[PDB]
Paper text:
DARPins combine all potential advantages of single domain binders over antibodies: they are small in size (ca. 18 kDa), possess high biophysical stability, have very high expression yields in E. coli, can easily be genetically encoded for in vivo applications and are devoid of disulphides and hence well suited for applications where they are expressed in the reducing cytoplasm. Structural investigations showed that these DARPins bind to different but slightly overlapping epitopes.
[name] did not show a clear transition up to 92 °C, a stability which is not unusual for full-length DARPins with three internal repeats and an optimized C-cap. Thermal denaturation of several [name]-clamps was assessed; they show a transition between 68.7 °C and 71.8 °C. This probably corresponds to the melting of the truncated [name] domain, whereas [name] remains folded in the investigated temperature range. The structures of the [name]-clamps confirm the intended design: both [name]-derived domains overlay well with the parental DARPins when superimposed on eGFP. Most interactions between the DARPins and eGFP are found in the single [name] complexes as well as in the [name]-clamp complexes, confirming that both domains can bind their respective epitope without strain or steric hindrance.
Author numbering:
A (entry chain B): 10 to 168
B (entry chain A): 2 to 64, 68 to 230
Amino acid sequence: PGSDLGKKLLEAARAGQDDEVRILMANGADVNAADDVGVTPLHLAAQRGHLEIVEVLLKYGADVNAADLWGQTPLHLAATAGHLEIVEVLLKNGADVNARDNIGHTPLHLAAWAGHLEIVEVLLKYGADVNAQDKFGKTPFDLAIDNGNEDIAEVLQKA
Amino acid sequence: SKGEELFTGVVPILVELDGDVNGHKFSVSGEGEGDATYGKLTLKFICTTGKLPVPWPTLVTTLVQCFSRYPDHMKQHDFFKSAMPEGYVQERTIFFKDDGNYKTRAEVKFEGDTLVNRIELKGIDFKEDGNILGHKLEYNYNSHNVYIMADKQKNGIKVNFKIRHNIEDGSVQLADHYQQNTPIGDGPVLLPDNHYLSTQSALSKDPNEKRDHMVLLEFVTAAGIT
């Protein structure tokens, strides 16, 4: 019942269970708990789009640039998935805007690839490197052209 | 496809591989997840048996194309996801150029809400001093093209393609993949027009893992018609 608070919290943040997260935090759960792969509650709440849990985890000091084994940070996850407000928040809490997953993607890379204009715009505003290259030498520009997202391309051009 | 809907959001993934090359016996397990909206796959793999006898990059190809991103315009050629959830079989023979071959049989399906890939692998006619078994490929993977031909003869998919593995010295080793996929169920299924799948991959090592293992990040998109 009070065993394995860290797993229980990971689960709750994956499942968007706000009331369970509240309890677990107020009752001692490690806010930076991590499974075998370095996945943390904040990675899971960022990926699955659960904002209230994201806000709360950061107020108890969730490490905002924690890195899983695939070099992903919650910022990459939220930026891949399209969660604009969550991106906004992680940036306001000092998320490393030019962080690298293991293919050398930056969240700008990910966001242009996946067709999230407003998230791009917001990453540019917080200091994203437009020329940065993945390990296959692509740029967020290319990736955006690969995928057919002209307006994103049009944008990246201007910086 | 009704089966495509099943790939909305994140799906956990289990992988199990039973193996024998030139009589060296081995077992691999993996887990992680995938996200077919973005062709993304996030995995880690363990050799449960000891040292692995062949190099990790030989297995990549053999260790769930249900997760490849098919864009709206190419949805009618997504065989793998139309065969879900009853799944498909995937058989392959992989010839390494001046060295042995792998034969693989695999069932890919939903058990529970877990997409699981269970593999038997027989390798034969390899050189105990050659690239494979002499551990001489580097820990590495490039960006490849995987061509899909419809295979009406079997209600499935024939596929040629070739991958190149960098060797420790500047040399390159070719692996010629011949593939057949047939549905497990007898429900209707989609037969693709010819297309390339294009890949990015990154192999890494987990710091706190003592066993012989590979961490794998991978993105995959169907890029076009022939």
